Design a protein around this ligand. Sequence first.
Ligand SMILES: CCCCCCCCCCCCCCCCCC(=O)OC[C@H](COP(=O)(O)OCCN)OC(=O)CCCCCCCCCCCCCCCCC
Lengths: 317, 91, 79, 139, 169, 103, 344, 96, 155, 96
Amino acid sequence: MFFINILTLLVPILIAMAFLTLVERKILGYMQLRKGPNIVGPYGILQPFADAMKLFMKEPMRPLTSMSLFIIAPTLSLTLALSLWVPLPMPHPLINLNLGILFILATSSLSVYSILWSGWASNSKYSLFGALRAVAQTISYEVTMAIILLSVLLMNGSYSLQTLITTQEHMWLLLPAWPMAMMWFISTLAETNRAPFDLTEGESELVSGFNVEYAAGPFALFFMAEYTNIILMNALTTIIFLGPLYYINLPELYSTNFMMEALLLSSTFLWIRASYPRFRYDQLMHLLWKNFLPLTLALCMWHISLPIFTAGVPPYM
Amino acid sequence: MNLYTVIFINILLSLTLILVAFWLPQMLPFSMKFFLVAITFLLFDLEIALLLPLPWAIQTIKTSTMMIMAFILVTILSLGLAYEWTQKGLE
Amino acid sequence: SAFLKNAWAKEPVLVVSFSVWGLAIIMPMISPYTKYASMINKATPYNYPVPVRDDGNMPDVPSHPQDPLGPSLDWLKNL
Amino acid sequence: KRFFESYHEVPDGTQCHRKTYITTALGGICGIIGSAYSVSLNPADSTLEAVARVGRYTFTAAAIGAMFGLTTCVSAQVREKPDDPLNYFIGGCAGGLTLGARTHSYGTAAMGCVYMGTAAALFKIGKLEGWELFPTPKV
Amino acid sequence: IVELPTLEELKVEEVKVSSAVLKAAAHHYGAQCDKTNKEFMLCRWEEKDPRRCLKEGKLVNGCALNFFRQIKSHCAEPFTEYWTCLDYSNMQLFRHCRQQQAKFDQCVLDKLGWVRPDLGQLSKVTKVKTDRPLPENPYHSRARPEPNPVIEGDLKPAKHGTRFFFWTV
Amino acid sequence: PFLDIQKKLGISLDRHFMFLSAEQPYKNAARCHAFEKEWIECAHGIGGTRAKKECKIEFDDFEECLLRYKTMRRMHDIKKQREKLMKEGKYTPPPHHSGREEP
Amino acid sequence: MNPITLAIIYFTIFLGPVITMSSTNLMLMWVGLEFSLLAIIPMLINKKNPRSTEAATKYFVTQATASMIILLAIVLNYKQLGTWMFQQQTNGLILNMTLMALSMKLGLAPFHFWLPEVTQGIPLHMGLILLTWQKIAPLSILIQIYPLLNSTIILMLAITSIFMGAWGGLNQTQMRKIMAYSSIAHMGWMLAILPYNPSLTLLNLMIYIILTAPMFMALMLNNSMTINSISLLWNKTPAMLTMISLMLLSLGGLPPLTGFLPKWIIITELMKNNCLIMATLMAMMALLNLFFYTRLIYSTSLTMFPTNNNSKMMTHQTKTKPNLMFSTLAIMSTMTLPLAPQLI
Amino acid sequence: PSTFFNLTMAFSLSLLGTLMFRSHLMSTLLCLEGMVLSLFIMTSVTSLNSNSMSSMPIPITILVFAACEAAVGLALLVKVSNTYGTDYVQNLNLLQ
Amino acid sequence: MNNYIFVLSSLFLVGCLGLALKPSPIYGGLGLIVSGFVGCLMVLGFGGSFLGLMVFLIYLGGMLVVFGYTTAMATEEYSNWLILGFLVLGVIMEVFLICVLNYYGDWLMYEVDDVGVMLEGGIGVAAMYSCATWMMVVAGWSLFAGIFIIIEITR
Amino acid sequence: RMMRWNQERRRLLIEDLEARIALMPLFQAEKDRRTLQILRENLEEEAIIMKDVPNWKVGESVFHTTRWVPPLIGEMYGLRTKEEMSNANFGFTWYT
Ligand SMILES: CCCCCCCCCCCCCCCCCC(=O)OC[C@H](COP(=O)(O)OCCN)OC(=O)CCCCCCCCCCCCCCCCC
């Protein structure tokens, strides 16, 4: 069985990953007074499969670049994204990593290597700058990203994502800790290099440094990775802060509710992209080492004291 | 093992895709300012590592101590950050 | 005070930032519950309570813990 | 190590073969170490040049080792005196002379003879009088 | 040698019921049968060796089996319903099943006369006077060395003074 | 140590945790706790020069609880020769090695 | 330096040795060593001259690898004895590592190459701290573990240092490096008696500190890093010529002055312990150290080197005075010998 | 067991590295770190199989001090390729 | 597979071998990353979780990340193949040495408390806040000073 | 709400910890009983494995003390099936 449970939890996500690009190229469209892709297939449903096949068929250009690293970075990217979905605590999570959140944090950090190495391997000036810019923003947003989680955990009692289903049986962790949700949402927008924070492949400012030289199959794999992440991080928002209803008798309700909230917050970063111009590099980092990091540090204290002075220490189960 | 099984499928799925990609289509910066930020990162990362143990410290019978200790950790590092600002190091 | 005001309206994060820093440095000191944390966590029975030799003159819980003598957590109950 | 020590076990002036062999090794060992420091610092120009210097120092040192061993042992047999420190001095005397030659300098042979021989003689006395070097703390 | 006890010495009837069964009756077993257990604990602690409390362990087991035989005889059905629901949960959490727990608890109070121990009152340390001899010299402690002797007396100005090279001092 | 500002001040910031038998968190004794005690209550009042010869039984044992090398050795021998007995078909694991058992 | 930073650093450079000395848990002794390494590096590059960056980058790599080796010894011990501290039972190789490592941080013998070079590129002031308040820490660790270390190695590092220090000094003309070389030598005597009578190490150090601290504040009074520079002392400030003369001969072992006592009692203790081989050779080349000390004497005092007209200008202006410490540490050093019995 | 001899030799192989520069300061600062990892792994390993929980603080104190140690090391490195345009050690030969 | 542990140790050794060969600073950083990964694996193998994570979120995290960053800046110029060759040379020699003792996972998890409820890695290190309160004060001072040391050394 | 919920959650936690507190006595006996069996069973095979070996005390405490030193995991399952040993060794790290 366990193998079947690996197909499910993977394929299903990959098929959904494909349908996100479509729901991105249509929701951005209707917001901009245009139908979006509806001519290939019925209502554009076959559109994601179509360019996948074009991308893989087109020549994988190997610039005259460190081959090993050039090819590895894509592999790492996809590997990490698909891996980060293993311990997610949808009911009866695939793998009850006791320290799951730490695992999520860890793999999320490793991704940075891909962009960095890709730029270095590409050997193009645009790519180099992209990597440097990317690593800096990525790691920095990791520093507030991690502290925001530590505040959460201390009110959950453990690192296991499964505990929050029992922590959020009466109220979402948004009510409490909303100030961090916002700061988790903005950090989730940075770490998936989505729009407001997409200086990694600004295209206009610098031309897609990450994949300047990447085309065809390598382009696709990161590509796939980004979008799967886009979902995963949104899904982590939908477990950590927006806690879906859960009933031991009926475990499905959780998944269904998890679906609805994940799709809406996934819809939100699509909506954010069309709605906002892109932050500058300096502006981006300032916001995090300056506008947020002081906010995130202080609340950490408040969340350390809160349990004690409220004698609300959580069970360690 | 269960994790090992999942992960190797994960790498296999990727490596399969890159290969298909290649096999199917047969037919000097001066980031000094950054440098500084990077170092602070290293430092802050380490603090965070010293703040990670809290989830179990919250359980310490010596709750007060934990509070004082923890509060100090965050506060002291906060000061370090502020200094960066005061000395205008980061700016 | 005046700067405080503008600070509340300009650079209104630090203000909030510090305010919290303090409020977390105060609530613990004044709280009808602060004491409970060290108790509630103290009480949790993680390790087995090894028995004691009933040598004599023992005011401890008399054998069956259901006996009246001994510590109680009714404070935890109805808390 | 049981080896080097053997030099001392058999009475001096006897079994010169083993004496000379042992003495030659010690010199050679010192040669290697000495060349090593000489190559690590004050490096050479080409690997070969340095391999040569190792050889030069090793052989020179091995030679001083041999003649010391040979002269002292033989001086003993001939003189029919096995514990006369002078034996060693003659040996050290010779050893210095080899060094002098390998450095192509009569003067060095002078200092070499006196200084080196004296040192060796003192070794003999040291052994004869049971002098202790690098002693354990016994306060 | 090792003086490992023989099998016949360590063969005794076994409880062998699913852990779930125990957790459901845990509270009551902590109630009806802690006399012998506490004593066994005392032995196993002060006397470090296990061989030194094996027999007590046999007594430990005997006390529970009948505990079960009583419940099997009376209010078996309630208990059966309570454990089955308790077992389904992955961490066999007690709160998912409270309706089944109430009927199981009320009945045995009604028939067996036992009582579910109120929150706590099981964690509290117990006093059991094991008639076994409180052991000594455990860990075959053996022997200790003699403290260096003590120089005794009172100080008197040093003799002839600092005796350093030519210093009348 | 060189300057005992700790004993003098009475503080114990560095002594409470220097050996395995010291207080363990949540009173969970560490391994080997049965010997180090026996090997330091022995060498207490007797200086080292004489904690090194007569209190050698307790270190030779504590050197074996921790390292646990003599055991490794004995067992390894048992393994090797058992291989030789199996080699001579003399021995093969019984159901003792593989069988059902008490809780 | 923002005076706040100056405080944090200086506190660390001072908390560094003090934690080492006070603690018994070796680990805490290691971090005391680590804090000293971190605190000293900022001060070393204060001028930020091209020579300085070289100095610090060497000092740091030499200090860092030695620090890692000391930690490895503590980590290994932890497995050979659960204790976090060296004991009678400690494997001999475990202790020898600590000797080599600690002899690198202190810079003794075949690891004496970093010190002369870092002493050359750092200011005279930070030179003193790098020579004397950074030797206290490692030596403390050794003195604590003396009962266990090897008599053979120490002696070899001791003798080597004496020789290297002496020979190196003979050629040097830069003062900073003459002192660096002397320190290597004195450091050698200190480590020679450690296995036998640690209490004398603490005398051969204090006296070295009470001798070197006045000597350096003398070199900087006129900030002369050259002998030629110190030779014109007679014009810049004539009085210090008298005591500079005695302190340098005191640094070497000449008998009336305080400097003889450390060598005399170390020789007495080594002969008491029977090293009359080792002690003799050490004392003999110790005499080489005085030769280069007296060569400086010649240039600075006994003979008057020619000076520059522009010097008359520096005379006119009032000379900023030497701190009081100079005097109190010059006299207690040049002449306390009549009070030796109590000192030991 | 043997696990420890591999880690120990790893530290010696890292030792041989830091003591034999190859024209790259960065690489060295990177080797130096290889030790700290080996020390951290060995300290954690024995603490874990001695069940000595009172000592786990150390495995981390080792890393915290080692990180800053490295921070200082890299700032010196950046200082060097600001004064000489390279991290190459040969450049560091002015103090002769 | 009892050999699991030995296998890991070997990988770690090999990785440190590469770092020892001192390849391009970036190659070195990569190698260490692999070793650090091996390291957390081994620690976890014994049972320590929090401990294993740390090296990951610290070494496999920024520790090499900044190195990486750093190198980009100060390491510009790319025999690595020859280095790779020597690496294989070392590998076989390494293997040869183990084969030496070959002619001449038995005991891990040496001792365990089968029933236990508050034993787990991290709890012990959590005692930095209680009964080990001098480790973390000195570490905090280390960081608070290091801020200042780096800001002037860069200044 | 969070304050009240965790206070309730804490009450449930103390309840089930105490539930084992009550049940461990039954398990402790069980463990020891079974543990000894494994040691003894290994004794039988022990008394049949190195019998031929000269100078072979069937078994003897690696130590001198007669104190009861608990059996390492290896000792208990070392001679036994590989899987058995592996299970114990790598059987928790690998979840259910
Ligand atoms: C008392 C106990 C302790 C608790 C105390 C609580 C006090 C009240 C709460 C205070 C803080 C509330 C807000 C927290 C998040 C915002 C933090 C912040 O300060 O914003 C920084 C930045 C705006 O900064 P800027 O305009 O540049 O000016 C800075 C002036 N100092 O922000 C930005 O620029 C963000 C840019 C975002 C671009 C994309 C925007 C997307 C908007 C739609 C999504 C919003 C988030 C949705 C989250 C859903 C749930 C996860």
